[PDB]
């Protein structure tokens, strides 16, 4: 599923991301935009052989199991494929664990490089929330 901006803002809000560990909703929408262009089915491979999955590009090296990342961890206890669902629940729940691990949203490179320090509220402007 390719989410619209406000559609996604509302789904994330419903799933408890607004102000989760101090990150306003705009932060999450912005990250999703630049990580996956709002596409739940996004996948990208990394040099180390790991793969990033879903709307928030969660990495198989530590968070999910894809059966092809030797030596990896599965800290969200889920198959990576679950992160590709049109239902963002698994992605959100795992993201909550990631953002809570000490490094905040810096775990998401696109967030750090394209959202951090910007006017992220612009991403939810005009949306009915
Ligand atoms: Cl933080
Ligand atoms: Na893994």
UniProtKB/Swiss-Prot annotation:
Top-level taxon in the UniProt lineage: Eukaryota
KW Secreted (keyword) present: yes
Tissues where the protein occurs: In the egg white and polymorphonuclear leukocytes.
PANTHER family assigned: LYSOZYME C (PTHR11407:SF28)
Subunit structure: Monomer.
Function: Lysozymes have primarily a bacteriolytic function; those in tissues and body fluids are associated with the monocyte-macrophage system and enhance the activity of immunoagents. Has bacteriolytic activity against M.luteus.
Note: Lysozyme C is capable of both hydrolysis and transglycosylation; it also shows a slight esterase activity. It acts rapidly on both peptide-substituted and unsubstituted peptidoglycan, and slowly on chitin oligosaccharides.
Annotated GO biological process: cell wall macromolecule catabolic process; defense response to bacterium; defense response to Gram-negative bacterium; defense response to Gram-positive bacterium; killing of cells of another organism
Predominant localisation class: secreted
Cellular compartments annotated: Secreted
Catalyzed reactions per annotation: Hydrolysis of (1->4)-beta-linkages between N-acetylmuramic acid and N-acetyl-D-glucosamine residues in a peptidoglycan and between N-acetyl-D-glucosamine residues in chitodextrins
Gene Ontology CC: cytoplasm; endoplasmic reticulum; extracellular space
Family membership noted in the UniProt record: Belongs to the glycosyl hydrolase 22 family.
A Pfam family it matches: Lys
Full protein name: Lysozyme C
Start and end residues of each C-type lysozyme domain: 1-129
SS bonds (residue pairs): 6-127, 30-115, 64-80, 76-94
């Amino acid at each position: 599923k390719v989410f619209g901006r406000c559609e996604l803002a509302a789904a994330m809000k419903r799933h408890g991301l607004d102000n989760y560990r101090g990150y306003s909703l705009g932060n999450w929408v912005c990250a999703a935009k630049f990580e996956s262009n709002f596409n739940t089915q996004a996948t990208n491979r990394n040099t180390d052989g790991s793969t990033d999955y879903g709307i928030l590009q969660i990495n198989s090296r530590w968070w999910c199991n894809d059966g092809r990342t030797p030596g990896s961890r599965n800290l969200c206890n889920i198959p990576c494929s679950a992160l590709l669902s049109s239902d963002i629940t698994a992605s959100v729940n795992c993201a909550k664990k990631i953002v809570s691990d000490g490094n905040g949203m810096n775990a998401w490179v696109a967030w750090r490089n394209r959202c951090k320090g910007t006017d992220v509220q612009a991403w939810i402007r005009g949306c009915r929330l």
